[PDB]
Amino acid sequence: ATPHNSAQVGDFAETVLMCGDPLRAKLIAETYLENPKLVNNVRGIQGYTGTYKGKPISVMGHGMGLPSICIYAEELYSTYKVKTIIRVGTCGAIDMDIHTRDIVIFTSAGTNSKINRIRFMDHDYPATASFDVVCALVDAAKELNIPAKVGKGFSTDLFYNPQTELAQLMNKFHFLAVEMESAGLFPIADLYGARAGCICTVSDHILHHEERQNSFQNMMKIALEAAIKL
Amino acid sequence: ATPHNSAQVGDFAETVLMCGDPLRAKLIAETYLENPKLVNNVRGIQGYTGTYKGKPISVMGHGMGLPSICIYAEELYSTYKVKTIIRVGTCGAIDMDIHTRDIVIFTSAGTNSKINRIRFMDHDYPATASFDVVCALVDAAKELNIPAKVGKGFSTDLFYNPQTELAQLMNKFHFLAVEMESAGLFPIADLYGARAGCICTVSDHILHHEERQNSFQNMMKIALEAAIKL
Amino acid sequence: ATPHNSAQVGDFAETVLMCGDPLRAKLIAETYLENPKLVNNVRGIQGYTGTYKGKPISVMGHGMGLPSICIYAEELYSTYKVKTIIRVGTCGAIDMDIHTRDIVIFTSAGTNSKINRIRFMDHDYPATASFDVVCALVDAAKELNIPAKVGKGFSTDLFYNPQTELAQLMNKFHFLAVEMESAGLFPIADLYGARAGCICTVSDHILHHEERQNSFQNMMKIALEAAIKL
Amino acid sequence: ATPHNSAQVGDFAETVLMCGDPLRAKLIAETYLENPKLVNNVRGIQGYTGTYKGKPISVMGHGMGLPSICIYAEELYSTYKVKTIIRVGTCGAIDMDIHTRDIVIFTSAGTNSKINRIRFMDHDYPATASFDVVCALVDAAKELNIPAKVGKGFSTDLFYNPQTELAQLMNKFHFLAVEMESAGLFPIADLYGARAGCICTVSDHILHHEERQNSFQNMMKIALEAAIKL
Amino acid sequence: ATPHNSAQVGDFAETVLMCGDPLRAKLIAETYLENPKLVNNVRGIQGYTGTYKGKPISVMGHGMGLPSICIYAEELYSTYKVKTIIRVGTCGAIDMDIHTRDIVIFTSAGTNSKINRIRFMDHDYPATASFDVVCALVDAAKELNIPAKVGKGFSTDLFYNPQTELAQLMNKFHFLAVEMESAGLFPIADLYGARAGCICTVSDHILHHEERQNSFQNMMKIALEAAIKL
Amino acid sequence: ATPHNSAQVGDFAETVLMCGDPLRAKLIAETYLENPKLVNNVRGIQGYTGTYKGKPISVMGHGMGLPSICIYAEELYSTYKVKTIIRVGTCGAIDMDIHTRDIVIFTSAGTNSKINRIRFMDHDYPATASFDVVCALVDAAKELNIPAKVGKGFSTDLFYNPQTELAQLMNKFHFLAVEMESAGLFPIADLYGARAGCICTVSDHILHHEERQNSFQNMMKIALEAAIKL
Ligand SMILES: O=c1[nH]cnc2c1ncn2[C@@H]1O[C@H](CO)[C@@H](O)[C@H]1O
Ligand SMILES: O=c1[nH]cnc2c1ncn2[C@@H]1O[C@H](CO)[C@@H](O)[C@H]1O
Ligand SMILES: O=c1[nH]cnc2c1ncn2[C@@H]1O[C@H](CO)[C@@H](O)[C@H]1O
Ligand SMILES: O=c1[nH]cnc2c1ncn2[C@@H]1O[C@H](CO)[C@@H](O)[C@H]1O
Ligand SMILES: O=c1[nH]cnc2c1ncn2[C@@H]1O[C@H](CO)[C@@H](O)[C@H]1O
Ligand SMILES: O=c1[nH]cnc2c1ncn2[C@@H]1O[C@H](CO)[C@@H](O)[C@H]1O
Numbered sequence A, B, C, D, E, F: 001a002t003p004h005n006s007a008q009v010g011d012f013a014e015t016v017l018m019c020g021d022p023l024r025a026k027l028i029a030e031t032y033l034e035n036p037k038l039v040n041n042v043r044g045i046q047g048y049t050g051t052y053k054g055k056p057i058s059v060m061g062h063g064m065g066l067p068s069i070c071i072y073a074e075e076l077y078s079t080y081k082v083k084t085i086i087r088v089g090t091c092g093a094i095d096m097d098i099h100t101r102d103i104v105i106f107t108s109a110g111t112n113s114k115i116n117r118i119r120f121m122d123h124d125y126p127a128t129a130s131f132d133v134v135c136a137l138v139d140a141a142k143e144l145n146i147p148a149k150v151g152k153g154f155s156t157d158l159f160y161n162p163q164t165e166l167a168q169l170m171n172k173f174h175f176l177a178v179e180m181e182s183a184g185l186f187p188i189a190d191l192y193g194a195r196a197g198c199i200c201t202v203s204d205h206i207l208h209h210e211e212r213q214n215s216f217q218n219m220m221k222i223a224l225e226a227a228i229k230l
Helices: A022-032 A066-078 A115-119 A131-143 A166-172 A182-191 A212-229 B022-032 B066-078 B115-119 B131-143 B166-172 B182-191 B212-229 C022-032 C066-078 C115-119 C131-143 C166-172 C182-191 C212-229 D022-032 D066-078 D115-119 D131-143 D166-172 D182-191 D212-229 E022-032 E066-078 E115-119 E131-143 E166-172 E182-191 E212-229 F022-032 F066-078 F115-119 F131-143 F166-172 F182-191 F212-229
Strands: A015-019 A034-040 A047-052 A055-061 A084-093 A103-111 A149-155 A177-179 A195-205 B015-019 B034-040 B047-052 B055-061 B084-093 B103-111 B149-155 B177-179 B195-205 C015-019 C034-040 C047-052 C055-061 C084-093 C103-111 C149-155 C177-179 C195-205 D015-019 D034-040 D047-052 D055-061 D084-093 D103-111 D149-155 D177-179 D195-205 E015-019 E034-040 E047-052 E055-061 E084-093 E103-111 E149-155 E177-179 E195-205 F015-019 F034-040 F047-052 F055-061 F084-093 F103-111 F149-155 F177-179 F195-205
Touching: A015 A022, A015 A066, A015 A212, A022 A047, A022 A055, A022 A212, A034 A055, A047 A212, A055 A212, A066 A084, A066 A115, A066 A182, A066 D066, A084 A131, A084 A182, A084 A212, A103 A131, A103 A182, A103 A212, A103 B103, A115 A182, A131 A195, A131 A212, A149 A182, A177 A195, A182 A195, A195 A212, B015 B022, B015 B066, B015 B212, B022 B047, B022 B055, B022 B212, B034 B055, B047 B212, B055 B212, B066 B084, B066 B115, B066 B182, B066 C066, B084 B131, B084 B182, B084 B212, B103 B131, B103 B182, B103 B212, B115 B182, B131 B195, B131 B212, B149 B182, B177 B195, B182 B195, B195 B212, C015 C022, C015 C066, C015 C212, C022 C047, C022 C055, C022 C212, C034 C055, C047 C212, C055 C212, C066 C084, C066 C115, C066 C182, C084 C131, C084 C182, C084 C212, C103 C131, C103 C182, C103 C212, C103 E103, C115 C182, C131 C195, C131 C212, C149 C182, C177 C195, C182 C195, C195 C212, D015 D022, D015 D066, D015 D212, D022 D047, D022 D055, D022 D212, D034 D055, D047 D212, D055 D212, D066 D084, D066 D115, D066 D182, D084 D131, D084 D182, D084 D212, D103 D131, D103 D182, D103 D212, D103 F103, D115 D182, D131 D195, D131 D212, D149 D182, D177 D195, D182 D195, D195 D212, E015 E022, E015 E066, E015 E212, E022 E047, E022 E055, E022 E212, E034 E055, E047 E212, E055 E212, E066 E084, E066 E115, E066 E182, E066 F066, E084 E131, E084 E182, E084 E212, E103 E131, E103 E182, E103 E212, E115 E182, E131 E195, E131 E212, E149 E182, E177 E195, E182 E195, E195 E212, F015 F022, F015 F066, F015 F212, F022 F047, F022 F055, F022 F212, F034 F055, F047 F212, F055 F212, F066 F084, F066 F115, F066 F182, F084 F131, F084 F182, F084 F212, F103 F131, F103 F182, F103 F212, F115 F182, F131 F195, F131 F212, F149 F182, F177 F195, F182 F195, F195 F212
Parallel strands: A015 A055, A015 A084, A084 A195, A103 A149, A149 A177, B015 B055, B015 B084, B084 B195, B103 B149, B149 B177, C015 C055, C015 C084, C084 C195, C103 C149, C149 C177, D015 D055, D015 D084, D084 D195, D103 D149, D149 D177, E015 E055, E015 E084, E084 E195, E103 E149, E149 E177, F015 F055, F015 F084, F084 F195, F103 F149, F149 F177
Antiparallel strands: A034 A047, A047 A055, A084 A177, A103 A195, B034 B047, B047 B055, B084 B177, B103 B195, C034 C047, C047 C055, C084 C177, C103 C195, D034 D047, D047 D055, D084 D177, D103 D195, E034 E047, E047 E055, E084 E177, E103 E195, F034 F047, F047 F055, F084 F177, F103 F195
16 A cells, blocks of 8 residues: 555554554564454564454554654555554653653653654644543553653654753753654644654663563553543 | 842742733733732733632733743742743634634644744754643633633744745644744743643634634633642 | 724824833833823833924833834834834843943844744844934934944843853854844834834843943933934 | 664674665575574564675664664664675655666765754764775676666655655756665764765656566675675 | 965054955055055965055955955954955845945845854854944945945855845845855954944846946945045 | 856866866966966956867866855856866865875765755755766876875865864764865756866864975876866
């Protein structure tokens, strides 16, 4: 159907969970989905579709970086008529009050990428998670009674950031953590009148290096339950 | 105490409602507050402090534009130890599905200003409303059962915008409305570990010109009730 | 007539003096004008019209910041057919040779705002005061024999500037003082084929904190006399 | 060893061929390498090491987009002491004289990404392929007598580019094709005093949609032979 | 003494007239100066020093473009202790009310160059002509009773400008003419606490192609007389 | 024919050597060309045309800075139908491994100028030397067996660069040397489907100040021989 997806319209559920690691997407499909069927493996992206509590749901990788997830997200909303994309993954803690293993729900994401400036006439576009998705994630967290931090994330184009002062600047402004996709995903959902959200588990702290399964499984529960609520 | 505020630490409540029009702030103080006392009138800004349902609450103008509200907000959090600032005002509808008189609660705000780039090492800072404030405003709206749209706002530096194509671009990305302060306010609250939010009543539509009291009074109810919840 | 002015075409003189503080504009009208009539008080802006030495002259506030004065200036030239706007106000000294209470006449103004880049295809627009106005102000100063410094001003978007190194940079380039409107005003006058100028009294020094009436009254004399010459 | 590579120093040859598609990297290892051993499969990246004509050589995926290849390239030069990285892949023709199936050797690559501006004090960094690698690729092409076009490439952050006019602009300046990694790879090699190059096979034309194996196999021959020459 | 000047401190007068064409500088020295002595001809720049009405005065070329004049101006103020530099040359009319042969005195100059952003922390630096020099030029013009237009100039980096819409934009904002040095010269004078100005004769109109000696000779009279007044 | 060239179509050879110093261009014409005829001296640019080993070849100055060479290069390709321009000149060493008197052949050039961003929709244009010219220069160097370094150059707009940290940054990225024209020349050749290259002799080192004829004569041999090969 597309240069990066061999599936056809209807193969994907209207709600899709995505993570950078394709092997993690495969694990998620085998671990949490019932009757998961591989619907797309172009570039080994591991796109699956099955059901959770009877409802259709797909999971697929999106690679690392805004350019990568921008390709997959745009194709899913445009061609496969997907309605909701929830990003599930790992991130690096920034704020001194955030620690490894904490679960973070992004309200929005800042970025050092030029993509949003390109689509927004060189102005400041606030990559904001869909309010419905943020709410579904927070309610899911409250119902499961799993502690989760809600706030700003930062999508970097440079995992190995040359600008070492940025880290402290983000701590002063209280950005919760860093990942590499949210800022790209959110605006695309807006353009297609669709929805997007993101929830991550802190795998380490960037201002000081600091069981990882429990945290990840708890994050998956929140995302899966929230997907149902949506 | 400051170049723009004659009041002293303690004269302002920890929660302050602000609007551009100083006369509107005076009206609000006389209409909704009990025992409102003028605590600051430097530059005729009309800063008052009284009580709503027994709780301390201040109201004051903030002028028009990011530079203006940036001065007032920073002084309130820094010098007067204010904790929460809720922006109450009017705005211009952008999205074709938004109409005059609708009430909009901003999740975040984009901008064509350079202020956030200056404070964020020339990167994209997502001016995001504090999640607690957004929630308090939405719950207040739900409890009062007053229809309100939640989404992106845009803080322009140019009321009379030379870039006429921006309007349609914002409609495609579904920005709800335009005002001139939010994008400046939100990051300042972050820096001071405090909170900020914004709720506005659409006074007109920019893509086509289209009782205004009811809408405004309903907005005030939401802001006042939300202030109590915070 | 406009969203920020209730007056009608003809209520304003062709020459208007403006200052940020609306109460200062009211004081000026009561102190220096004869038969001052309030012609606009939307948002408590205090717009008056009277006569000085028999000639029609209006005074009104313009709020703080480029966005604010940009709204008022554009409406005055476009709708009220105003020809000359002279900004009268206070400013913060930058240059080490400039001291508190000195009077400064701006030849032009730099800025950290993005407004001029937006209107000038992202290039460098030199916000320049109208040569006629600069001359009228300098001649008025020479005739009244009141010492005044002539040179570059800087219109900041951030009263509380995070970039602390900018201050010394401006001292090296000899910017005289800092305010928050000139850079926005000047280009608008150009666009409407009209005129604009600015004169300020230093209220303090930003590189080191350092009767204020005499200085202000002397500045008013220069502006008023220059208004007549124009 | 690294967050994206489980291999240890010495597992990778000093020369590594990389392509976006991990499955293509696996195919390449099984098709052109002798005794290929999987040395890294974190995130299913398919990193292999074997020999070509007796010489050690590794092949691995790098995902799509500058951020992705930037992570892998930096780790390979820094941690695994790799000396040469040759990017092998597909691209979209821009120039009207370039057609589908043509083989292109990049001298350099332009980009709409902000990464190089971030590492080069906001100036223009010319992402240039290492002259030794360009020469090795061209000589390999000449020796194998396989027609190949040499010139500028463009690394986009947006596969689906909103700026539709850019395509014709690039045709006027004669950019040969578009991909999504080169501009990021080249500067990293420079920083580590190492080498990088890129060769691609045109899979389609962006200005007009237009056996694909022969072209790909011919490209692999050029890259493999050039790797030996280096 | 410098990489571009063989003269020594004292060989240049404190006031120097400069034009792009070195042959024009030689002509000027032979035509208007008494006892002109060649003090610098590195790169055939034709730097001379003589006297006008008994006062020491030097004339020299400065090449075309901001980078070129930036080298010469900085060396003159820094090494040769020059105090005043008056740029004398030709320019292309922009404003519809300006015609070929008109004489223009620049109050300031805009630019599409990045030089001033580099020296001014990426903000808007208003390249402003020294008020003393502007005044001396205007008074000289008034005393000689030679009509001259005073206003904004534009220093382009592109004689052949790809951005064809800029011309009309500058007409709307009333830029008088275009040249290629002023915007670079003015800030340098500021940095050295020295002075600079510019006066040009329109050689053609860019919005429509339209004796040239009289105009040039009249311009020289104004510059020479103004040099004496300074 | 043009505002900067009095010659007519056909007066210039299809291959032109250019250097900043017009006197150097005259020397080159008298020293290496047979029957050199002055074909253009507007602004004393010293444009000559003669023959080298029987083949037509022109030499002319281009002033200092991108704006200057941009004027001359564009006119030569557009009006005089020139096909190849080889820049011959001096430069300042950056890389610690490069020393005074070394000969450098630019593969490409970075810049702090805004010119390429203006012509390339504000993106990163890689000012790349034509591969044919780079090859001709390197082969000429190999045949004459004259040691020459091949790599990145940097075209600065500021000979006297305020950003003192840039020098070390360029050393880390291994830019070979600094000049002031290449980045402007290369893109123009691309636009006209023509060719351009650059070769320079290091006259000094910018990170530490460090017979100059031999080096220059060797550079001329390489350029002249390469011109024949093209
Ligand atoms: O600290 C981090 N910086 C950037 N990305 C991170 C970080 N931690 C986890 N990720 C996530 O995993 C990949 C990078 O390894 C990216 O896809 C990002 O989403
Ligand atoms: O359409 C609009 N554009 C910009 N600001 C608006 C608009 N409508 C209401 N406001 C609000 O009132 C002032 C401008 O008149 C600004 O303070 C803004 O917050
Ligand atoms: O130091 C200063 N920085 C910025 N603005 C100043 C300063 N001093 C006086 N003003 C003027 O008063 C308001 C700010 O308080 C602004 O309106 C500005 O014009
Ligand atoms: O036309 C194209 N635009 C961008 N990238 C392309 C194109 N053709 C091939 N690729 C390559 O494959 C991925 C995108 O599908 C990117 O990794 C890019 O390198
Ligand atoms: O129309 C013009 N655009 C740019 N520069 C001009 C123009 N007219 C005269 N000059 C002047 O002469 C050189 C360019 O030929 C530049 O030095 C500029 O100062
Ligand atoms: O170190 C240098 N920086 C900039 N340009 C240089 C340098 N060395 C030689 N040139 C060359 O000569 C002129 C500057 O004097 C410029 O034309 C440049 O090409």
